[PDB]
């Protein structure tokens, strides 16, 4: 069927900026005189597609003019004029000129910061989950950018490498940082004849590892 | 405002059968095209299937992928879009919208998420996460609740009832050994917590489970 090649997957821009995504079908999506059935779409975390962009260059009922569509031969492209916050989330072309119709892979939009160091907390095991033979250490790393960091646990001074679970949030449509949360899980066993327990993160705001700790005995 | 919105996902075996619904309204449902489209990681967005008008004599057209195995079918007197799925594969899972669509619109559900899998139900348990002791460090405070060892998703979290969304971050769950976890962290002023109360509301619909967790000063 019509392959729809959308490019590029990440796009980093700054408040203000414009923004250009392509799509390329790989056949004519004329479906008939004034009608070619390309459309844009806008997918924000957390929710369903939105329209954007019908018929190529037709803005949809609400949608702002800086956004805009065009086409010729079987290239296409949104353009994102005077980008804000809100803006953020993944980008689709969608082809209903032919069965079966046929999306783009999407385009990430990635709104351009200021850097900022993640502030980090630290959680030890509750005494519920004690009480059942497990024990997870959280830490998270909150409002940072850009969105890499690293995260190293260690116990009394050893880095723990196994056991580790970590999941990011999306880039927040307000102040457009990442979130990062990282849990360790251990036997209530092997946690009960350890002391120290680290949260240690690099980050390219700072040379130094921003470190978070607490003592079993202590709390 | 035009509205949509699916129901019927859920978790089903390899080979199992289900029945999405999708009801309609803010617009002449009858009038119009109706597909259902699903999504996943693996595949990005991909069109499932679609039925068009009475005049057309309910004409439907189908993926590849899905032909005689699901069927669309339409109500048009109770504004109703049917999904019926057989034979279904651990590939066939995803979120399923239904999305109604004319020249010069197109608007989508919310989705329903189906989950193929074998592996079976379980409850989540709900820990409190409180700050190490101290003395009031900084301005600020930041709590937590870590949503552990369930299946499949979703779960619902909320802090105070929803009361409370700045200062949230809510993290996607992790998927390992066939079980997901989740956490979640609130960040308020350090005045407000412990004086205040903070509770970490979680529903675990597959299960049954609802809780809420108060968190307590170590």
């Known amino acids: 069927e019509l392959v729809m090649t959308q490019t590029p997957l990440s796009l980093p821009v700054s408040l203000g900026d414009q923004a250009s995504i392509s799509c390329r079908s790989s056949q004519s999506l004329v479906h008939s005189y004034g009608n070619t059935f390309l459309n844009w779409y806008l997918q924000k975390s957390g929710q369903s597609p939105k329209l954007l962009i019908y018929?190529?260059?037709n803005r949809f009922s609400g949608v702002p003019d800086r956004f805009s569509g065009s086409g010729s031969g079987t290239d296409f492209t949104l353009k994102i004029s005077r980008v804000e916050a809100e803006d953020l989330g993944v980008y689709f072309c969608?082809?209903?000129?032919?069965?079966?119709?046929?999306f783009g892979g999407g385009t990430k939009l990635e709104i351009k910061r200021a850097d900022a160091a993640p502030t980090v907390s630290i959680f030890p095991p509750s005494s519920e989950q004690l009480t059942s033979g497990g024990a997870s250490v959280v830490c998270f790393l909150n409002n940072f950018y850009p969105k890499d960091i690293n995260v190293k646990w260690k116990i009394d001074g050893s880095e723990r490498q196994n056991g580790v679970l970590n999941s990011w949030t999306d880039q927040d449509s307000k102040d457009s940082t990442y979130s990062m949360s990282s849990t360790l899980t251990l036997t209530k066993d092997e946690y009960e004849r350890h002391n120290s327990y680290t949260c240690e993160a690099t980050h390219k705001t700072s040379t130094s590892p921003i470190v978070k700790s607490f003592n079993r005995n202590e709390c | 405002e035009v509205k949509l919105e699916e129901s019927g996902g859920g978790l089903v075996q390899p080979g199992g059968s289900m029945k999405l619904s999708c009801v309609v309204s803010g617009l002449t449902f009858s009038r119009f095209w109706m597909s259902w489209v699903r999504q996943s990681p693996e595949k990005g967005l991909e069109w499932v299937a679609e039925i068009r008008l009475k005049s057309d004599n309910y004409a439907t057209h189908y993926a590849e992928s899905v032909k005689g195995k699901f069927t669309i079918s339409r109500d048009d007197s109770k504004s109703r879009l049917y999904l019926q799925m057989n034979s279904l594969r651990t590939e066939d899972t995803g979120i399923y919208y239904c999305?109604?669509?004319?020249?010069?619109?197109?608007?989508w559900g919310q989705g329903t998420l189906v989950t193929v899998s074998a592996a079976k139900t379980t409850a989540p348990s709900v820990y409190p996460l409180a700050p190490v002791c101290g003395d009031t460090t900084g301005s600020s405070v930041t709590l937590g609740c870590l949503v552990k060892g369930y299946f499949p998703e979703p779960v619902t979290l909320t802090w105070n009832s929803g009361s409370l969304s700045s200062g949230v971050h809510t993290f996607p769950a992790v998927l390992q050994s066939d079980l997901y976890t989740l956490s979640s962290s609130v960040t308020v002023t350090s005045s407000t917590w412990p004086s205040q109360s903070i509770t970490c509301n979680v529903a675990h619909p597959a299960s049954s489970t609802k809780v809420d967790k108060k968190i307590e000063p170590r």
């Open positions: 999305k109604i669509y004319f020249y010069s619109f197109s608007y």
């Open positions: 969608s082809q209903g000129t032919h069965v079966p119709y046929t």
């Open positions: 018929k190529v260059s």
